[PDB]
Structures are given as C-alpha cells and as structure tokens.
Design a protein around this ligand. Structure first.
Ligand code: PI0
Ligand code: BGC
Ligand code: FUC
Ligand code: CA
Ligand code: CA
Ligand code: CA
Ligand code: CA
Ligand code: CA
Ligand code: CA
Ligand code: CA
Ligand code: CA
Ligand code: CA
Lengths: 254, 142, 191
C-alpha cells in the first residue's frame, strides 16, 4: 500500500495473508469460514500447490499472537478465461482445508448480490484497499497491515484521465479503476488479491480485488481492481460445488 | 392609450402607463431620453410569465424577465414542481431506502431483503444479525 | 444510444436545473450529482426530458462544488457536466424596488430582499440571508444626467432637489464574484 496508514489490529478482520512455502505471496478476502477470494495472477508461478497457506487474524508479520489462524488451501479455482501473465479476469476462489474460527479479529466480508453492487455499492465514492504490499513503487513490503481509502471511477473517466502507454492492457467490464493520479496514494504489487471493501449503511461488502496497474501511484494513472460484481454467480455456484482432486481448478466463465 | 385630445396634455407615467397600457412612444414621451426609455420598457413590456400558473402542486411562481421561478412545497421539485418526491420508491433511488438488498416490483412497492446472517426487522427496511459474527461487521467497533 | 452533450447549468437564486441535448429518440436519461468526495446520488430517473432540477440537492450546501453526469439508455453511456459552485455561480434574479419614502431633501429607496430556493428551517432564505456581506445593491437613478449609489444593506438614503422628480433602478451585485456579479436592472420606478 502506498500513502496509506496502518489498519488498527482487528479493524481489517477479513484480510487474508497468502503464503506459499512459508513465503509471503499475496493478500485475500475471507467471505465465509470456508472460502477466500483473492487474485488469479497470484498463482502464475506456483510450483508447490500443496504448500499454499492462508492466514487470518494477521496484523504484524513480526509478532505472533493467538488471533492468528492457519489453514492449508485445499483448492485454487481460477476462471477458465484467465491467462497467466495477463490482466483480465484476475480472480480466484480458494477453498480452505479446515474452516476458520470466527472471532473478534477474524470475520468475513459480505459477498453482495450482483444488482445491489452495480446499482448501489458501485456508487459509493470511497472504499478501503489494504495489504502488506510495497509502501513505495519498487519498494519494500510492510510489516503491519496497511489500509487506504480510494475513490472509485467509471472506466470512461479512468481512460480520459489516464495517459495512454505503450499498448497497456485494456480496462474491461471485468475491472474498474480507483485511486489517485497525482502520485500520492494507491495499492501495490504485494497487495494483489487483497480486498476493495465498500462501506454501506452499517455493513461492508466486497466490491473489488487488488489486481493491476501502471506501477504504484504513478502520476496520471490509477489502480485497477477486479470488478467482483461480475463474478457473484460464478463464486456462489462454485461454493456450492463439490471439491475437485487437484488443487488448481479452472472453472468455466461465465 | 390615446383618447381624443389627451395628447394635448403633458405626459404622466401614472395616467399613461400605470393606469393604462402605454405604447413605447407614449413612454418615450414621458422619459424623453433614449436609455431611460429603454431601461423602463424592458420590464414594462416583458410580460409576466407567471400568468400561465406554471408552478404545480401548490407552488409559487416568481416572475423574471422572459421566465419564472417556481418555489415548491417540501414534497416537490422540478422546474414546475411537477415531481412527486413521494412517487420515487424504486431501487435505483437511494437503494429504495433499504438497508441492504432492494427488489423492484411491477406497479407495487419495492421489497427489501438481507444478506445471509441477517434478518429483516418489522419496518421492512432494516437488517439485524442472526449470528454472532455476521459478514461486514467489525467486532471491536460494535 | 447517444451520450448526452452540451450539458448546461441554469441557475437563478439557487433554482438550479441542468439541461442538455439532444431531443430523446428511443433513449431515456438518468442524472447523478455529487460533491468531489461524496457518493453519487441519482435524480430524474429514466426521464425522457432533457432537463433535471437539482435544486434540492445543491441547496443542501451552496458552497460545495457539484459535478453532474447524464446517463443515457435506449456501464452506460454518459457525459459529465461542468463543475457547479452554487454560491459563486447562481444568477441573481431581477431586483424589485419595494418602495421609497421622501423625508425633506432625502429619499429612502428600499430594495425588496427577494427569497431564494435555499431552504432553512421550514423557510426560504433571502438573498441577504445567504450572501450576507457578499451582496450589495447599486442604484442607478436620475432627476426626471446619470446618478449612482451603492449600499451594503437593502436600502439607499439619497439627496434630492425638492420639487423635481426622480426615477429609480437597482441591481443585485456580489462584488467578490468573477462570474455573474450583477443581476439585470429592476423595473423603473418614479416618485
Ligand atoms: C501493463 C503492465 C501491467 C499489466 C503491470 N503493471 S506493472 O507496472 O508492471 C506492476 C508493478 C508495479 C510495481 C512493481 C512491479 C510491478 C501489472 O500490474 N501486472 C500485474 C501482473 C500481471 C500478471 N498476470 O502477471 C501486477 O503486477 N499486478 C499487481 C498489482 C496490484 C496493484 C497495483 C496498483 N495498485 N497499482 C499494481 C500491480
Ligand atoms: C407560462 O408562461 C411561461 C413563459 O415562459 C411558459 O414557459 C409556460 O409554459 C407557461 O405555462
Ligand atoms: C408560495 O410558496 C410556496 C412554496 C408555497 O408556500 C405557497 O403556499 C406560497 O404561496
Ligand atoms: Ca502476526
Ligand atoms: Ca391616456
Ligand atoms: Ca397617452
Ligand atoms: Ca384614463
Ligand atoms: Ca392612479
Ligand atoms: Ca411621439
Ligand atoms: Ca403622451
Ligand atoms: Ca403621443
Ligand atoms: Ca416578466
């Protein structure tokens, strides 16, 4: 996270930390005791699929306490339309091997219904993005969970206000932009897969996923998030499905 | 206006423009000066656009030059107060007043719903948790 | 569908209405207004008009800078409007001289402090209630030679030659302003 602040322990209870081979990998968003939503590009180069770990209740990667809960990732489901190395459909549904215990420091973020998210939530100017990602462009990651409030933009304004680059990726209907273009605040590489949580009338909902962008807080550029509203059905259908043998699962989309 | 022989009489704005309708000439004869005549004739000839009684639902029209302004009653709005602020109970309008989910319905009024882990209170708009740790809530802040 | 264009702000005494084009032919519109850091609020849902009264929204804080965008239907096609800061841009209506009483060799010309669309506690605030000191009225009168006079209230106390008669005209003016600093001249009145 760039230009943000530390999330007071417990105030980002749905934040997930993804570790591969004990090493830090990406962020995530818990939406129920059994499922975690993250980004698909986080698995572009995973070799040991049997070594993915999801930690909840995390906060300070430097000090352990009893709020921490670990779970092996039993399954990583990526849309069949996602293409490693690219940007479209940057989404992943992860099944934990054992359900996590809901506490004051571990709580899920609500997966909203499609229309409610497109018709209402998408019109809430601000939402929270967080993670243990880089505090600067090409910088080092954070030890304590960082959180940042970023304004949302409609693709049309995002484009009009973003200065074209050497054939960068298109901003599709499966993503949206949020953040600032002055070089002050934005999420970053190490935050990939983390939540873009939106507050609405007393409850927080999942509206996006830290996905991609031109560097981190680059002047004349915004952060790009996976438009989750576009996958609600995909996710629910899958969460009701039976577990598959291997870890990696490419499910058809739509 | 000009009756017979009244023109022999000097000019008076009262008898000529207030008490009757006075053409531009009659006015020019009272004011003499071109600009003074034009500054008067602009408002004098504009014509009260509030005559149509454009403002609806008990509004109040305030005349302007070639236009009006409608001051509406609390429950109204729109150029002519034609908009019923009570006839907008659809989901796209402030989520239909619902706390979480909103569902429009042909003709009838919209219905509200809640996310798993919550329930709809008798007001048909709010939602309360039906589990200890409903999604979207931050424990240490509740 | 064709995205709307030429979105223009029409505001007088805070009565604010956003207009646009073209003449809807198979397409309906929906307006959204907000403050730079506020949530987007919809208005004039699926209207077939090419206008939208945003008075009730902007009067909530005439000092805010609202942006508006018109959604077009047969993310949807839209067009953003120019920024609108009510207080700094709303046109001052045509003044109306309330009266003028003579007291010897002086005249008391009184300007009617018209009301605005700004609601406050179940009532419409006047132009003075809103602009306070930012508002002044200027008098352009003459011995029925041009004469002027400016006041920081809604009245003018001027000297006049006994016997001779006078005609009067006033204007609302917000000196600080850069845009629409004056209203049009009020109707001419003579004692
Ligand atoms: C046109 C090149 C982009 C596609 C590329 N831009 S970049 O500048 O190369 C990123 C970058 C920035 C800083 C150090 C290292 C890399 C990009 O973004 N590539 C993807 C992976 C593509 C994959 N499927 O492998 C990526 O890095 N996603 C993580 C991420 C999350 C949030 C932000 C943010 N809020 N801004 C930025 C980046
Ligand atoms: C009353 O008069 C005004 C004059 O502009 C007109 O616009 C209205 O349509 C009419 O009802
Ligand atoms: C004019 O103002 C409107 C708002 C209503 O109060 C009317 O009764 C009044 O005449
Ligand atoms: Ca820790
Ligand atoms: Ca006559
Ligand atoms: Ca005559
Ligand atoms: Ca007569
Ligand atoms: Ca008379
Ligand atoms: Ca003549
Ligand atoms: Ca005459
Ligand atoms: Ca004559
Ligand atoms: Ca008129």
């Amino acid at each position: 996270i760039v230009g943000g602040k530390v999330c007071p322990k417990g105030e980002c209870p749905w934040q997930v930390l993804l570790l591969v081979n004990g090493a830090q990998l990406c962020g995530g968003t818990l939406i129920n005791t059994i499922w975690v939503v993250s980004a698909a590009h986080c698995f572009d180069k995973i070799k040991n699929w049997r070594n993915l770990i999801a930690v909840l209740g995390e906060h300070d990667l430097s000090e352990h306490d009893g709020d921490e809960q670990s779970r092996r990732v039993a399954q990583v489901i990526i849309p069949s339309t996602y293409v490693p190395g690219t940007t479209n459909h940057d989404i992943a549904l992860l099944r934990l091997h054992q359900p996590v215990v809901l506490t004051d420091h571990v709580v899920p973020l609500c997966l909203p219904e499609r229309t409610f998210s497109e018709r209402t939530l998408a019109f809430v100017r601000f939402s929270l993005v967080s993670g243990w990602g880089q505090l600067l462009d090409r910088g080092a990651t954070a030890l304590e969970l960082m959180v940042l409030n970023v304004p949302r933009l409609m693709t049309q304004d995002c484009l009009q206000q973003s200065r074209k680059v050497g054939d960068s990726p298109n901003i599709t209907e499966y993503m949206f932009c949020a953040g600032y273009s002055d070089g002050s605040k934005d999420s970053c590489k190490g935050d990939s897969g983390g939540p873009h949580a939106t507050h609405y009338r007393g409850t927080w909902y999942l509206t996006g996923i830290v996905s991609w962008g031109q560097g981190c807080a680059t002047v004349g550029h915004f952060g790009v998030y996976t438009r989750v509203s576009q996958y609600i059905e995909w996710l629910q259908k899958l969460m009701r499905s039976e577990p598959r043998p291997g870890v990696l699962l490419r499910a058809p989309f739509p | 206006a000009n009756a017979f022989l009244e023109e022999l009489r000097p000019g008076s704005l009262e008898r000529e423009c207030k008490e009757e309708q006075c053409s531009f000439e009659e006015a020019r004869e009272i004011f003499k000066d071109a600009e003074r005549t034009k500054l008067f004739w602009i408002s004098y000839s504009d014509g009260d656009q509030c005559a149509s009684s454009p403002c609806q639902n008990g509004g109040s029209c305030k005349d302007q030059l070639q236009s009006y302004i409608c001051f509406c009653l609390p429950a109204f709005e729109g150029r002519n107060c034609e908009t019923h602020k009570d006839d907008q109970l659809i989901c796209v309008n402030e989520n239909g007043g619902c706390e979480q989910y909103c569902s429009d319905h042909t003709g009838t009024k919209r219905s509200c719903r809640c996310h798993e882990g919550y329930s709809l209170l008798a007001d048909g708009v709010s939602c309360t948790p039906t589990v200890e740790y409903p999604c979207g809530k931050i424990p240490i802040l509740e | 569908t064709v995205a709307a264009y030429n979105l223009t702000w029409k505001s007088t005494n805070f009565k604010t209405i956003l207009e646009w084009e073209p003449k809807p032919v198979n397409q309906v519109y929906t307006v959204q207004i907000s403050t730079k850091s506020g949530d987007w609020k919809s208005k004039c849902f699926y209207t077939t008009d090419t206008e939208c009264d945003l008075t009730d929204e902007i009067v909530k804080d005439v000092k805010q800078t609202y942006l508006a965008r018109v959604f077009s239907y047969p993310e949807p096609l839209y067009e953003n409007s120019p920024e609108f800061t009510p207080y700094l841009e709303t046109n001052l209506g045509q003044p109306t001289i309330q009266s003028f009483e003579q007291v010897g060799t002086k005249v008391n010309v009184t300007v009617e402090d018209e009301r605005t669309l700004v609601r406050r506690n179940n009532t419409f605030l006047s132009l003075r209630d809103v602009f306070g000191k930012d508002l002044i009225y200027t008098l352009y009168y003459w011995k029925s030679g041009k004469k002027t006079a400016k006041t920081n209230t809604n009245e003018f106390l001027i000297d006049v030659d006994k016997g001779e008669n006078y005609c009067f005209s006033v204007q609302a003016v917000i000196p600080s302003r850069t845009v629409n600093r004056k209203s049009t001249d009020s109707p001419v009145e003579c004692m």
